[PDB]
């Protein structure tokens, strides 16, 4: 059993943010919502679909209809920037959604620049191979990075950083794919795919230069 959440939602200050969470027959289950700010423990903000704990501001509300649970934040404020997780029980197993990063926009959105480097001939001579995908100047600070072997997904060997804030208040991240030399040479190409706010940039490198 899975619950699917958008990886990121962004809202201007004062606008209504809506975070959705879909699950099979989720209307039969009680949905809960948790807020987690950087470096802190989660805190319940909605439980039993719609109930708000005492001390949670009234602009937070929950609903569960059409088999999607929705966390709604009206008049969203800077302090509401956080990760939000939905949660439901499926036969004694506790299931969390993947999490939604809510950004309260303090500046206009910025698209990422992506640079992809193939393994160096030196590293290949050392019987190793690393591809390097560098992602810079994006805002909000949330991206999805996916690697492709030819046109197929990569199943192992990816290491991706959490985005970090640059001097200019945009974000940067990097992703690394470790391969064997035989894997590098036996594919026509590898690709780094970066998705940001619903747009995708894909860079591709090949062993045959």
């Amino acid at each position: 059993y899975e619950l699917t959440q958008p990886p990121s939602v962004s809202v201007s200050p004062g606008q209504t943010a809506s975070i959705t969470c879909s699950g099979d027959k989720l209307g039969d289950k009680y949905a809960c919502w948790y807020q987690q700010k950087p470096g802190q423990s989660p805190v319940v903000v909605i439980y039993q679909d719609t109930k708000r704990p005492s001390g949670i501001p009234e602009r937070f509300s929950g609903s569960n209809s059409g088999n999607t649970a929705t966390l709604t934040i009206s008049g969203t404020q800077a302090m509401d920037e956080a990760d939000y997780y939905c949660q439901a029980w499926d036969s004694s197993t506790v299931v969390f959604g993947g999490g939604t990063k809510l950004t309260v926009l303090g500046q206009p959105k910025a698209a990422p620049s992506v640079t992809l480097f193939p393994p160096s001939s030196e590293e290949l001579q050392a019987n190793k191979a690393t591809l390097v995908c560098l992602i810079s100047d994006f805002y909000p600070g949330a991206v999805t990075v996916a690697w492709k072997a030819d046109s197929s997904p990569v199943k192992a060997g990816v290491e991706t950083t959490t985005p970090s804030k640059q001097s200019n208040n945009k974000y940067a991240a990097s992703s690394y794919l470790s391969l064997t030399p035989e894997q590098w040479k036996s594919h026509r190409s590898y690709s780094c795919q970066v998705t940001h706010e619903g747009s995708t940039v894909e860079k591709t490198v090949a062993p045959t230069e």
Binding site: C32, T93, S174
Partner: protein, 224 residues
């Protein structure tokens, strides 16, 4: 309003064992089901295990079955998690969480959560980096310029510093924060954007310093 306080986290080698505990205050520990949840760095929440107050109903996530054991001592207000055959994948912050819901109505939720305790499963020791050149390209950062760089691979512990041409090249330099890999080793990259016409005339050298391993590398980055 009420609190859970976990302890026992720390550094353990792959295949090692560790026991976590959690102490409750402000509520009657023996009245509630208790849960463990973990969160790997930069990742999402993953439920680990649950136990009723009576210890007669106990459930585990598949990812930990056969290796972890949940237990509780009501008289000591303590929840425990015995963790055996630990793997790098088990590296995470581990949270204690109370379920104050109604089991009969299958109406559950987690409140409160503890502050969490960090478990690091790693056999990394001091290691100097391998430094590899990232040969120039003008396909992504151009307009008369080319990006080149150095890959600083598989070092431990932090930090590493990188400069270019002994520090005389500073504009256009972007050194990226290191990734902590599942191997427990760090890697980082530094790139500089330079005029593409200089690629033939100007030597570019990244100066890498890793004081913890007493390693320095000056790597020339030549065009292909």
């Amino acid at each position: 309003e009420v609190q859970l306080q976990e302890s026992g986290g720390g550094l353990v080698k792959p295949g090692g064992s560790l026991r976590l505990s959690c102490a409750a205050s402000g509520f009657t520990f023996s009245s509630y089901s208790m849960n463990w949840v973990r969160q790997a760095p930069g990742k999402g929440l993953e439920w680990v295990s649950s136990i009723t107050s009576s210890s007669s109903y106990i459930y585990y996530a598949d990812s930990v079955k056969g290796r972890f054991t949940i237990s509780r001592d009501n008289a000591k207000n303590s929840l425990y998690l015995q963790m055996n055959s630990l793997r790098a994948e088990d590296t995470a912050v581990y949270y204690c969480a109370r379920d104050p819901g109604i089991a009969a109505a299958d109406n559950h939720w987690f409140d409160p959560w503890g502050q969490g305790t960090l478990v690091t499963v790693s056999s990394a020791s001091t290691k100097g980096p391998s430094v590899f050149p990232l040969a120039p390209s003008s396909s992504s950062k151009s307009g008369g310029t080319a990006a080149l760089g150095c890959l600083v691979k598989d070092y431990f512990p932090e930090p590493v510093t990188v400069s270019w041409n002994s520090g005389a090249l500073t504009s256009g330099v972007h050194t990226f924060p290191a990734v902590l890999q599942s191997s427990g080793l760090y890697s980082l990259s530094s790139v500089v954007t330079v005029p593409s016409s200089s690629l033939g005339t100007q030597t570019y050298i990244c100066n890498v310093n890793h004081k913890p391993s007493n390693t320095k590398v000056d790597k020339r980055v030549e065009p292909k």
